[PDB]
Design a protein around this ligand. Structure first.
Ligand SMILES: *[C@@]1(O[C@H]2[C@H](O)[C@H](O)[C@H](O)O[C@@H]2CO)O[C@H](CO)[C@@H](O[C@@H]2O[C@H](CO)[C@@H](O[C@@H]3O[C@H](CO)[C@@H](O[C@@H]4O[C@H](CO)[C@@H](O)[C@H](O)[C@@H]4O)[C@H](O)[C@@H]3O)[C@H](O)[C@@H]2O)[C@H](O)[C@@H]1O
Ligand SMILES: [Cl-]
Length: 168
């Protein structure tokens, strides 16, 4: 209900989102995964600009906006690949199952603390993971997760819960 430490937050309806939440869950997404996805886009989709307008290791793919550094470091299907091969990450834009599998491989590779740091701030986050900005990003995700956990209707309805987290 009340927003996380100083932040703006709220909720609104997105047509079709409930059916999409169900698809994400059936692909293996947990409530934490749904909260991460919910922060990134409204419809849990990949129609955002290619790479989220970033190239190389910072390029974002899939519904979670995973970056290429983390994908190539953690996920078997990208093993051994380099920063310049980032266009290969676009496979996740058309395969939800692979997107979720890669998310789980990445979270296990890093552990969740480091994972949040890299997911928010890339290589700079991995080497400086305990910043105020990373903590606020994590807090936003866990606040969204709390809304999902508090009422299971939110796992399948059209409601989007959000916290304003400035883009970087
Ligand atoms: C999203 O917007 C929300 C909004 O916050 C609010 O909730 C509103 O109601 O709804 C909107 C959605 O409809 O907000 C998130 C959070 O800001 C945006 O996230 C963006 O995407 C990812 C995942 O969260 C992150 O991207 C990283 O960005 C960093 C910094 O550029 C990159 O780090 C670099 O990595 C390089 C390679 O290693 C390295 O050389 C460099 O030094 C640096 O370390 C990293 O690779 C990722 O690209 C980030 O969180 C980003 O803002 C989301 O797009 C949307 O706006
Ligand atoms: Cl730090």
């Amino acid at each position: 209900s009340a927003c996380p430490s100083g932040a703006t937050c709220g909720s609104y309806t997105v047509g079709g989102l409930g059916s999409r939440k169900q698809q994400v869950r059936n692909a293996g997404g947990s409530s934490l995964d749904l909260a991460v996805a919910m922060l990134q886009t409204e419809r849990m989709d990949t129609a955002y600009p290619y790479g989220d307008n970033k190239s190389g290791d910072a390029a974002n793919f899939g519904i979670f906006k995973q970056n290429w550094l983390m994908l190539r470091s953690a996920c078997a299907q990208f093993g051994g690949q380099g920063a310049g091969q980032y266009d290969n990450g676009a496979a996740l834009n058309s395969s939800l199952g692979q997107d979720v599998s890669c998310l789980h491989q990445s979270q296990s590779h890093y552990g969740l603390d480091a994972w949040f740091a890299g997911h928010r701030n890339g290589a700079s986050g991995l080497s400086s993971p305990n910043t105020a900005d990373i903590a606020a990003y994590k807090a936003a995700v866990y606040w969204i997760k709390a809304q999902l956990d508090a009422d299971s209707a939110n796992l399948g309805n059209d409601t989007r819960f959000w916290v304003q987290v400035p883009a970087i």
